[PDB]
Amino acid sequence: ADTIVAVELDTYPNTDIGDPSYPHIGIDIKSVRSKKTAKWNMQNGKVGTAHIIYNSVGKRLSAVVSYPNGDSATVSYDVDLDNVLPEWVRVGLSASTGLYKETNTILSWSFTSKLKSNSTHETNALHFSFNQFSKDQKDLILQGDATTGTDGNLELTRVSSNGSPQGSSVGRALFYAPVHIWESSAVVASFDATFTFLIKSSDSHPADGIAFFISNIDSSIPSGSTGRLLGLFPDAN
Ligand SMILES: CO[C@H]1O[C@H](CO)[C@@H](O)[C@H](O)[C@@H]1O[C@H]1O[C@H](CO)[C@@H](O)[C@H](O)[C@@H]1O
Ligand SMILES: [Ca+2]
Ligand SMILES: [Mn+2]
């Protein structure tokens, strides 16, 4: 298959596949069944901010998701990503809807990765930030239903003209350039990502969520990965 490391903002409890009974954030290492989760209050129609942070020294993948009123949830998981991810990856955002739906609107996304080594701050680095997306965002690989629009946003999943999110949708956006996420001779490999998002739904139980993910460079939406699989995984194993 792909190799996926992800931080999921999971809006819809799929308890039959190990989701906690409440919306949650989670750290997913090669499985949709998060290695760690934290209860998350998704604030319908509010703009949230997710931060993901890791460095190869601490070997701890951390995420926090917050809303302007100060509510937040955080999850951290100890993992040496050198032993999980390929050396070269692509980084992306994914989202899905299913029977129930929600907008999976990304308003901004930044990412920074650095590899530092042996001597001085002699280093390879990648940093990108999108605080606006354009209709033809050539440095994004859009997959599935993901679109960017003149409205400055990245709609990961289908939204109708009337602004209504659609079910059975899956979409991703990957940064165009592969990222050298680790290297054997790198003394420190660190990355951080931030994205802001607006999940809004008229469904009493919106679904399915948004994820920041890191994958093999040729990662594509696995078949049948709408709904609970968040566009990341081919199955719920
Ligand atoms: C009830 O289970 C479906 O919906 C939830 C909420 O969206 C998903 O988490 C779950 O994966 C299921 O989605 C599948 O089935 C939906 C129809 O029942 C379909 O719309 C989805 O695209 C997906 O196949
Ligand atoms: Ca879920
Ligand atoms: Mn989950």
Task: Give 207 Cα–ligand 1 centroid separation in angstroms.
Answer: 9
Q: How far is the CA of 147 from the CAs of 47, 51, 121, 143, 223, in angstroms? A: 19, 22, 38, 8, 19
**Is the alpha carbon torsion for 161, 166, 170, 174 positive or negative?**
positive
Task: Confirm or deny that 33 is annotated as ligand binding.
Answer: no
Rg (the chain; Cα; Å): 17
Domains of the chain by residue range: 1-237
Q: What gap in Å lies between CA 133 and CA 117, rounded to an integer?
A: 34
Ligand nearest to the CA of 33: 3
Ligand 1 neighbourhood includes 207 CB (under 6 angstroms): yes
**Contacts of residue 127, Cβ cutoff 8 Å, sequence gap at least 6:** 110, 111, 112, 113
Q: Is the peptide bond before 208 cis (omega within 30 degrees of 0)?
A: yes
Domain 1-237, CATH? 2.60.120.200
Number of C-beta neighbours around residue 70 at 10 A: 6
Q: What gap in Å lies between CA 2 and CA 86, rounded to an integer?
A: 10
Q: What gap in Å lies between CA 200 and CA 75, rounded to an integer?
A: 23
Number of C-beta neighbours around residue 35 at 10 A: 16
Task: Give 12 Cα–ligand 2 centroid separation in angstroms.
Answer: 4
**Contacts of residue 137, Cβ cutoff 8 Å, sequence gap at least 6:** 130, 148, 154, 173
Token duo for residue 148: 């960017």
Residues facing 92 on adjacent strands = 174, 213
135: left (phi over 0), alpha (psi -120 to 50) or beta: alpha
Q: Are 31 and 17 in contact (CB under 8 A)?
A: no
Q: Compute, in degrees rounded to 10, the torsion defined by CA atoms 137, 169, 93, 128.
A: 10
DSSP label of 165: B
Ligand 1 neighbourhood includes 168 CB (under 6 angstroms): yes
- Specify the ligand 1 atom closest to the Cα of 100: 7
Q: In a 10 Å sphere around its CB, with 0-12 CB exposed, 13-18 middle and 19+ buried, how is residue 202 labelled?
A: exposed
